[PDB]
Amino acid sequence: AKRTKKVGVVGKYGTRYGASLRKQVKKIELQQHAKYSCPFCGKMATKRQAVGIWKCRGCSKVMTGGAWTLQTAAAATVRSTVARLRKQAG
């Protein structure tokens, strides 16, 4: 069975805090409790040890990342642009 209609992971927080605030939490709480793919081994076993720290369970390696996802999109843009700036300098 699916055992709630909508609220999902945030049935936890019950009948309080207000539904707009509760939804903001739902979408990024869904991110952080996810497993992500490891860069280094491949296996999708990465968990968030602490805000800004992620550990690949199978691999044993730890790496830095976002608060609530492995790769923040701003940081993905910098990895693109610094690879470009290195190439044109030669």
Place this chain on the structure above:
Amino acid sequence: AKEIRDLRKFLLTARRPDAKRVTIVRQHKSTVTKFKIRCSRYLYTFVVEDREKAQKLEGSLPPSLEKVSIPG
């Protein structure tokens, strides 16, 4: 504390000159017996089951060694 398991070692530990006494225990079940040499660090002890071997063994202990003690 410690045990001995054979007659090679028990003859050495008796003859060793800091061994004080040999208390000898006997108990009915049949007549299983214990020798115990109080040496200086440890109380060594040697279980024998047959009485006729143990009677022979008490002769093999030295006379110049001091004590012997028995229950009964």
Place this chain on the structure above:
Amino acid sequence: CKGNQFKNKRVLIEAIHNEKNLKLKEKALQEQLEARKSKAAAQKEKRRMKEL
């Protein structure tokens, strides 16, 4: 078993006997088709050697 399905030990044992005794009646059917599709080639190859 981990789902729910079987409530006693007896129902699991009764389930294993039902689902094994299919595969005996399967292997009666499967062995003859493996024999006959071999004998489809074996009747052919005895004929096709006798061509030359």
Place this chain on the structure above:
Amino acid sequence: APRLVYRRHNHYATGSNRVRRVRTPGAKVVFHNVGKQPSRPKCGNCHRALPGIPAVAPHRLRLLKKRERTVHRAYGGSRCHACVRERIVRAFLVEEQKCVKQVLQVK
């Protein structure tokens, strides 16, 4: 029925004052202060526990014979062994790649 009293100076429920109910030749039930459970040597950089070498509190590692505190290998006392293979396969190859250049640097 029978209920007991702490024997040592510390009458509180800390780590150090861990205790173990025994009964005696008296038929009398009584504590013994067994200490904290020793962590056995997790050793780097893997941080796996080492086979061969027992959990003791670290002053009692003195009592043991030297044999017992190690493993007879290279880096045996503090290494994973598996980790050790890494050390050799590095130091073999990183010398060989460094050597192959320095013969090619004669030209």
Place this chain on the structure above:
Amino acid sequence: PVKVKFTVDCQKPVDDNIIEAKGLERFLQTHIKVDGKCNNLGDRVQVSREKAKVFVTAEPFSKRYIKYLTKKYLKKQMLRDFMRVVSSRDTVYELRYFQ
């Protein structure tokens, strides 16, 4: 199965004339239960005396159960204060006095 022959001598009593040792034989014939049965003595149980001292023979039985039944007897004769049952050995009781 094996067999055990016990005893209860009444000798220090009877020579004062206070116990009748005939009475205790016929008491134990009646009152002993076998398989939760009374007066159903056959082949397991065999009760028979010198008269100086009574014997009881059994097949699963308990040394205790004889001391239970002799305490039952001594209450009916009003002799509890005078004597008590005591183990002389394994396979034996003796009757005694208080001091």
Place this chain on the structure above:
RNA sequence: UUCCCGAGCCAGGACGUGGAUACUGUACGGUAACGUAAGUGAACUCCUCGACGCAGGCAGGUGCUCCGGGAAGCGUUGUCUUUGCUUUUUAACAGCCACCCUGGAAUCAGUUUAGCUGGAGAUAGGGUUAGCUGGCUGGUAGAGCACCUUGGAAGGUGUCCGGUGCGCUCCUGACUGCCCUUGAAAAGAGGAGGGAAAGUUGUUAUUUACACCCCUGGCCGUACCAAUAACCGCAUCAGGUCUCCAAGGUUAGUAGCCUCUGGUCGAUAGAAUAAGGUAGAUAAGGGAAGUCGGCAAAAUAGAUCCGUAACUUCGGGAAAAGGAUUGGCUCUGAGGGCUGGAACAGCUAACUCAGAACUGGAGCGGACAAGGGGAAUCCGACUGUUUAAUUAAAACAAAGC
């Protein structure tokens, strides 16, 4: 835990006899994980232990509690009772009982209560290692315990063999989850990398924890109370004051009620039973008409089965509301484990549900325990906080903005 008897251990420092190892230079064995009676290692450097959160269940262990057999003594006995109760114990210390090799996985397989694990090498077969408060022997029966007989304190027997569990206690172990919370340091002990030194077949030299042997361990606290009488409240004051251990029955239960071990009867007494008090019960008919106001007290209450609205931030409301059943006794059915190889044959252990018959002054959550409910308005969103001794709120805080 300080005295005595017995059995050990540790720190510092060490003679001696007898073993190992080397003498053109520090032991060997195993494929390995690592091993054994020993098996040198200066300067300097790196590492480990010391060294760490909370919640959750799961498995294993100590102690407790429990059931049965055996042996002692004890109790009850007008009646019945192979019966009911007590004892049946074993210390620290000391010895022994995740990772590697072969191999190469999809018709994916292994596996937990729960998820996880696997070509960065799974299942399987064979090893190595970690461990607890596990088992056996020593310690150790000489002690302790329970009984019996002679003295007027001497001498004896016995102390045996098994179960059970979502049980209670503390501990360990590996897991799972939680955080804009990620959960001390230093003394001290040890390992490794390094190779400085010494040692030429004998008074040598490394072993001071290789085995045994030898010597020394200062200073101070240590009585007793720890509270309805040893503390603080002016007092032998119904007040206050941190920690540990924690039995049986009933029950979900460390709730309430009764009990065993241990503890206590300390609180000025005797006689009468007026009014008025203090606390506690009960009242025909009516049922808030009392009162500022249902204030006080009644009524409801457990468990099982059925049933459950407006409204809603869809999570709730909800134990909504509204009903039926429950005792005793006698039965029936369903639910495990271990042995020898279509599933059979033997031995056997739990308290948990479902249903039926009978029976009773229609009682049965029989004492104890245990929500009154519903319809609306105002304020504050919520949990949280506050005027120690007249104000707990609508006040403070709060996340969000």
Place this chain on the structure above:
RNA sequence: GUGGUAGUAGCAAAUAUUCAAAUGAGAACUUUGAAGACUGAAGUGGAGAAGGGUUCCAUGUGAACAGCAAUUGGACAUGGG
């Protein structure tokens, strides 16, 4: 310093005592027995800390103190630990 108030208010929470014998000048109250109760293992039980400081233990006793009594005592005195 002393009255009247006045032999008055009052000594009523924590379920509870009773019978015998011994001791003594004297017993509702001390001790010993026999009964009957309570506490009911998050105990009024067994051990520590803070605080107290000899209250601990024994023998003895003329007062006062222990809101009645007292042969008892954390009181008083002499010893010991």
